[PDB]
Amino acid sequence: VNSFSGYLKLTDNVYIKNADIVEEAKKVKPTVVVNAANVYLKHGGGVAGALNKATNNAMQVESDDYIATNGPLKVGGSCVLSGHNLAKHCLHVVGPNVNKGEDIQLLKSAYENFNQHEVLLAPLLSAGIFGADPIHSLRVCVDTVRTNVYLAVFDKNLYDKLVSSFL
Numbered sequence: 001v002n003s004f005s006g007y008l009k010l011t012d013n014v015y016i017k018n019a020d021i022v023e024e025a026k027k028v029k030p031t032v033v034v035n036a037a038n039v040y041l042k043h044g045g046g047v048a049g050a051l052n053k054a055t056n057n058a059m060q061v062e063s064d065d066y067i068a069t070n071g072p073l074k075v076g077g078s079c080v081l082s083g084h085n086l087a088k089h090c091l092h093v094v095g096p097n098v099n100k101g102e103d104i105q106l107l108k109s110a111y112e113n114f115n116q117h118e119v120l121l122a123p124l125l126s127a128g129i130f131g132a133d134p135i136h137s138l139r140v141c142v143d144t145v146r147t148n149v150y151l152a153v154f155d156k157n158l159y160d161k162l163v164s165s166f167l
């Protein structure tokens with residue numbers, strides 16, 4: 001039993017909810033919140049901009065030190081950093097950004113990072129300003145993640161379409 005509330009169960013291990021991931025993280029304080037990161041960990045907009053804002057820019061400060069030491073992530077890759085006031089840990093995962101021409105096949109590799117964590121609160125990777133089809137992203141998530149994932153979908157209209165169209 002865990003503290004997530006109000007989720008629709010899609011499969012044995014995948015759950016979904018219309019919610020703001022920032023507000024969901026602040027309420028649940030999960031072990032892992034997933035960020036929709038880019039390879040430079042520049043958290044300017046979308047989910048990343050919102051999560052970083054909620055940490056009062058501490059996420060960005062930590063991230064800049066990480067990049068200075070380690071260099072950029074790979075598309076499809078991830079790193080574990082602090083969750084600050086939102087979670088114990090933040091798993092920064094880089095899905096392909098279609099608006100940059102990145103290969104959508106890398107979306108499966110991105111979701112594979114979730115399997116290193118027993119339970120996660122997460123957005124749909126590569127959705128929103130990353131330009132991929134959120135219905136497809138949900139399909140890849142369900143077919144790739146085997147650990148327990150709680151998906152937060154900010155847009156109510158999108159959430160209803162994802163549920164209604166889910167096979």
Ligand SMILES: O=C1CC[C@@H](c2cccs2)N1Nc1ncnc2[nH]cc(I)c12
Binds near residue numbers: 019021123131134
């Ligand atoms: O609703 C969706 C569907 C795809 C995804 C993205 C689209 C472009 C970049 S990410 N998204 N965003 C969010 N999901 C949950 N909480 C959130 N808080 C702030 C935001 I913005 C946000």
